[PDB]
Structures are given as C-alpha cells and as structure tokens.
Amino acid sequence: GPYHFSEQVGHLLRRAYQRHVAIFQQTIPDSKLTAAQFVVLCALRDQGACSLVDVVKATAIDQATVRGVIERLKARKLLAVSHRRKVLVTLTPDGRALVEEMVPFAEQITQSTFGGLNPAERVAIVYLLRKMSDA
Amino acid sequence: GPYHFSEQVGHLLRRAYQRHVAIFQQTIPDSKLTAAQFVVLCALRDQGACSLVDVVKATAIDQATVRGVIERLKARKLLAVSHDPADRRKVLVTLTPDGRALVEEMVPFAEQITQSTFGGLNPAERVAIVYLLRKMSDA
C-alpha cells in the first residue's frame, strides 16, 4: 500500500552512484585523486582550456564544488589558472600525466560498476540513464 | 574508442542522480529538508528504534552523511536520542511525533518526485531501471 523509500528510483540512483564512488576509491592508487578531481582533470584533458561554466557544463558538478576542486588541483600544481573578471583553466603536464596514469584504472572501475549486469543488462541501463539525464 | 569520462556508466549515474536531487529540491515543500534527511526519516518510520549502523544498513547511506543528518534532525526536534536498553553505552535514534507527522506530510510529494524522476520512461522502462539499479547495487 504505502510509501517504501527503498524501492524508489531516486534512492536506487543514490546507492548506485555511492557504490560507484566507493569502487572508485578502492581502485584508484592511494587516494591520489577523488572522483570529482578525476572528472575535472578529464574534462580539461579532452576539452582544453576552460572557463568555470565550461567545466560545470562538461562535468555536471555544481559550481561551488568545482571551484573547490580547481583550488585543490591548483595547489597540487596539476592545473593552471589565469585572468579580467573571467578566468581560464588548463592542465599542467603533471596534470596530463596523472590523468594518463589513472585512465587504465578508470576502465577497471567501469567493469566493477556494471557488476553482475550481463551484456544486455549493461546496454539497457546505459540506454535508460542516457534517456533519463537527457529528458 | 579511447576513454571519455562522459560516455561511461559512472558519469551517467552522477548525472541522473543530480537530476533527481534537483527535482527533489524543486518539489519538496519543506526547503530545510534534504533527500538524505528525508530517507533517514523514512527509515525510522519503517524500522522504529535504530542505531547509527542500523540507519546505514537500512539506507546504504554512508556513516558520515548519516551522523550529519541525525545531528541536523536532532536540532529541529524531528528525532530523539536515547540509550540502547541492551547497552546503556550504545545510542538509539527514534522518530519524535513531529518527525512522524513530517514524513506523512511529505509522502505525496515524494511520490510526485518519483514520478518526475521517471520522467518520460514508459511503464516497462520504469520497471527495467529499478530492477537494473538494484541488481547493480547488489554484488
């Protein structure tokens, strides 16, 4: 009859996300990188120099988090920032090196994330998530 | 093809979960209440007295997020803290009557949120994704 939160799609997205992030933490050597940091670095590797809303657009991460992430990555010298109200952001060579070094592990993470799902299941979930985030 | 972070299943989960939380925030009347807060409250409604790990188990929300939720809900007097009758040392959280009312008040909206989140998925697609997400989250 009533509400069961555990069987609701919204909750089941959180678990699946959360599970993905935990897998990412186990799999990435020595908490070198958070998942958000990795995503921002990838966006920069693929796209090139970006504004802040470029990075938000690219990564689907809220602006306040991205600002934080860029600051931490600036500190670690993995990216560069430059002006005069608007800023650019660009990979440093260590930046790109770290990304390249982690991309073999990120592949691992994907398989793990898909879990028990069989190949038809894998296609189906990706189809459904695409169809969900789009519309 | 090479690795693009955006095509991969981790990102689509991220995007779809962002969409859900935006939907949650837009439609929930009580603007102080977070998706995590709400879920914890539903778990106490369904389970009665719970330890911190009970809530982590019931919800699969991480322990840091849970303590934070509990602390926030303690402040608004929506849950009470007691001692475990088994262990005078170990602590229990329990809905207050106010907590129970608010859960009941939000149920319609939660249901709407679910509907919005499914968006334009057809009745079979709604079943398929709930199933695949559970299968994914097990093992």
Residue numbers in the entry:
A (entry chain B): 13 to 95, 100 to 151
B (entry chain A): 13 to 151
Paper text:
BpsR is a member of the MarR family of bacterial transcriptional regulators. They are obligate homodimers and many are responsive to ligand binding. Recently, we and others have shown that BpsR controls the growth of B. bronchiseptica by repressing genes involved in nicotinic acid (NA) degradation.
BpsR crystallized the in the primitive orthorhombic space group (P212121) with 2 dimers in the asymmetric unit. BpsR contains a winged Helix-turn-Helix (wHtH) domain for DNA binding. In the dimer, the two wHtH motifs are positioned in tandem to one another to create a DNA binding surface. The overall structure of the dimer is similar to other members of the MarR family of transcriptional regulators. The RMSD between BpsR and ecMarR is 1.38 Å (over 129 Cα atoms) which is indicative of high structural similarity. The model suggests that helix α4, from the HTH domain, inserts into DNA major groove and likely functions in DNA sequence recognition. The β hairpin wing motif extents away from the protein, along the DNA helix, to provide interactions with the phosphodiester backbone and the minor groove. Although the DNA sequence for BpsR binding is likely different, residues Thr76, Arg79, Gln83, Arg84, Lys86 within helix α4 extend towards the DNA bases within the major groove, providing potential sequence specific interactions. Within the wing region, Arg100, Arg101, and Lys102 interact with the DNA phosphate groups in the minor groove also contributing to the stability of the recognition helix interactions within the major groove.
